[PDB]
Amino acid sequence: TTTSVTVHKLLATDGDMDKIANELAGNKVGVLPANAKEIAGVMFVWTNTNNEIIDENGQTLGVNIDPQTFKLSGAMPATAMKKLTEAEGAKFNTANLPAAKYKIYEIHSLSTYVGEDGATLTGSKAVPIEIELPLNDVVDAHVYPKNTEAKPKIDKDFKGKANPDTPRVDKDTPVNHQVGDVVEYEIVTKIPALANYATANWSDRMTEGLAFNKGTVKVTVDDVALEAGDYALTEVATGFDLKLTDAGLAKVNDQNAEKTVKITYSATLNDKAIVEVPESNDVTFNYGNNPDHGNTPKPNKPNENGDLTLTKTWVDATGAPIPAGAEATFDLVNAQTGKVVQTVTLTTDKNTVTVNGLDKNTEYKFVERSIKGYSADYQEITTAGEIAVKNWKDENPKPLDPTEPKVVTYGKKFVKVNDKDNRLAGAEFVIANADNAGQYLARKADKVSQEEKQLVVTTKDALDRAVAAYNALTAQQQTQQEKEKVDKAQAAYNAAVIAANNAFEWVADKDNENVVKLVSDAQGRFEITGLLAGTYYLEETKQPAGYALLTSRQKFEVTATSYSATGQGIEYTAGSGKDDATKVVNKKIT
Template identity: 25%
Template sequence: MKKILVTLTSIILCLPLLMGMTPANQNKATQIQVVLHKIAFPEGELPQDTKNTGKIDDQHAELLKNYHGLNNVTFDVFDVSRKFYDLRQQGLTVEQAQEQLAKLGPNKERVATGVTQNVGGEDGTLAFSLSSTSTQADGKDAVYLFHEAKAPDYIKEKSKDLVVVLPIYDGDKVMSKIHLYPKNERKTTIPPRFTKVVTDGKANYNFGDKISFTVTTTVPADLTDYKFYKVTDQADEVLHFNPESLSVTIDGKDISALFEKTIRQHGFELNFNDMKKLEPYEGKTIVVTYTDTLMSHDKVDAKIVNTASLDTDFDKIVKEVDVKTGGKRFVKVDALDSSKKLANAEFVVLNRKGNYLNQEKNGFTWTNDVTNHNVVKLISDKNGQFEIRGLAYGTYQLEEIKAPTGYVRSKEKIFFKVSETSYNQKAGVLKVVNTQERRKIPKTKKPHTGIFPKTNDVFNSKLIWLGVFILFGVVIAYIRNKKEKNEE
């Protein structure tokens, strides 16, 4: 626990704006309430003295957020009005008179006594109802000394006496309820060992995964001065606690009889209120195991925090662990013109085992049946964009099952990686391309023209070859006929 530099008052040194004295004949005897908030500080962390405004929301109240209120402290209240006014007549200022009275300590005029306890959930609280005027000072404004009469044995030394001079003002208004913050420094104690871990050591999960946590704490070796011992677990809103998974053991044996259990949607509270039951286990380790289900895929690339705390009479120990889930963004574009975004392409997601991403009521699962009606289908929007969220870190594949109109469906699977920054980084947007379908030119039939074929037609070509053959035959016959005549 870090040391708080803010300091607490030991005596009430009230400025003129905050208090004053009024002649008795101008005041009627009324009751004012003084509320003590007793705070215990570890050895070496006792803050310095500082002025107290009497308000409930001043800097002293902040100390209660970091330190415990201390119960079972006895305070006596003494009327020291007569001595105060005697000191004032001797020429002492209000502040000087207060300091002197604090050094003198209690007198014989005890008017009230009480013991600090838990009031409204706050430990170390004690309220006194006191008269605003003093009979021993002839009805003048009362001056009270608050003396710590008894404290637990583990307290190093008692707090200094507090002197309050009435009335105390908040601006120009008399305060009817005054808050004081006496402090104690306790003897050094060894804080209980307290840990919290993700049981399987992983740091990232799929939407719908059950995440196992383990909390351990060592019971103090001496519980004599302990009045309570409380373990609290509070998870992020996207983590839902599974009550049936809660197990609390010592040496492997269930110890449910030792505590009171409070279950909440995002956590639990274990109150060990009966220290007598816990004493046989001094020095032993309490092991708490349970699971939370990741019920949302909205928190991508962000810490999903699970906090455990141990509260005792002396210590407040807080341990945090966090898990994450990831995602990936894509854009569907034309293969030749990446500025052209393609809508209505459909994809499914596969893991390394070749199973398809499936979404049930409480999260993702994996199936080997692509026809399952729960298989997650990613469809590109009018800007070509589509995405997947809620995946554990790792490598996955996209398989296109429907191409945009006018494009060829890609038969190759596209690998992509989910990591801590894969979703939110601009550079992480993966372009998925499609090629346009080839245009088919229809064949046109040539019209039939009967016996008059067109030039270059097949029929016309045959006639030409026939003419060549006849001509060739005529030439051969002519040559033979001429040769025979020459021989005669």
């Protein structure tokens, strides 16, 4: 008794779609919402309740549509019930159709969305229409489907480099940076047209070797800077949390075009950066038509014995305790490398899981594999070896988590020897950028604390006592025990120097308080860390006892693997097996 069904494609906001919803599938909607626009050129096809494309008499055509992909079995049949919308919609003749349930799908690829004023627009495909005929006592039915939810797009990269559509592919390859370098970052987010977000939050956390620079965050929407009342910015040592306020959400929601949100900020590479170990940041976009309590994973180091424990709690959107919703799966990721180490699953009876045999010096993160209707809230790290997640039944889509670029420092190891190839203590050195003129590698004092500075001084004084006492001994009095005393003293000075070295610079004075001095221990060991790859010149400032002061500077090469590669000339430690250091040969006075 429903002779015709007219399908209308609309591009409207949710609110306008809700104005239509309550005002009726049914009768023609007389007055359409204010800004809601009807679109012509939209291809709709009718199917069986079992998704099979149908003829006008209701007879199947051997081709079916996938409920979630809309990809059809084979060729679009010539006899199929397909019609293109007019600014009046697609009026189909349902007269020959039996009383039954039918579905109406949109073939998005076949459609050319043309708006009210003839403009060729771009929109989201419609949610399939499940309708039963006769549509009560309606002779000429009208159906107003809702469109699908377009996914937002993101990317995190270095300033300029970010692209949400086509993010860079070589992100694992870390950029070489020296200690104290400011790393300029970019987060680019594309928010879809006509969005109705209750929450648009960006969350950034980095590894301990990257120090987020507070007050560098600059947010813009379609290259127009945001007012401070559009977003709420929380800033910490490890990163930040930017959450769009109602004012800022107005600038991204119900827009006629795709919105582009740009987030720029920076972080300084520090003393806690490990040589040839990359440092990363980690962004997540927690969007939703519902308030969202989700954020970015927070990295953490395992405990002393190499154990990292995950704790999980579940709450409704209100924050009230609920039983465990599903089997929560997590990825244990090396927060520096980005590679997945292990995979953990919490069964619905357990709310804790522990990982064993992890490097205590590496940062790891548990990245929850999305649960339908639940949002992951990684709580603030309070201790090593322990990670907490609060799971909120926010009923929102999975967050966006782009791939992040990595940064890395290089080093070089050295061993102080004589011509007989015997190991020497107390030789002191400087690093010059050139053999002729050339400044000396120093610490940026402004960046280094008074306490830090002073420990370098006292640990240097303590080391010279250990070196003097060792030179005081005879060749046979210099036992492994007497050697170890110089090593303990040296290891403390080298630890102090690295700690004070949180920014480098080049200075004229080879004996300026801030000049980086390297001292050879009882095994002749001495290293430099936090450098850009390149050519340097090691200069001797104090010779070892009984040897001559060297007249020429030893040239050296800092590479991506100069600290760790074998085939260098001499073993840096004892029984390490790696031939991971360069010889510095001292000659006797004549």
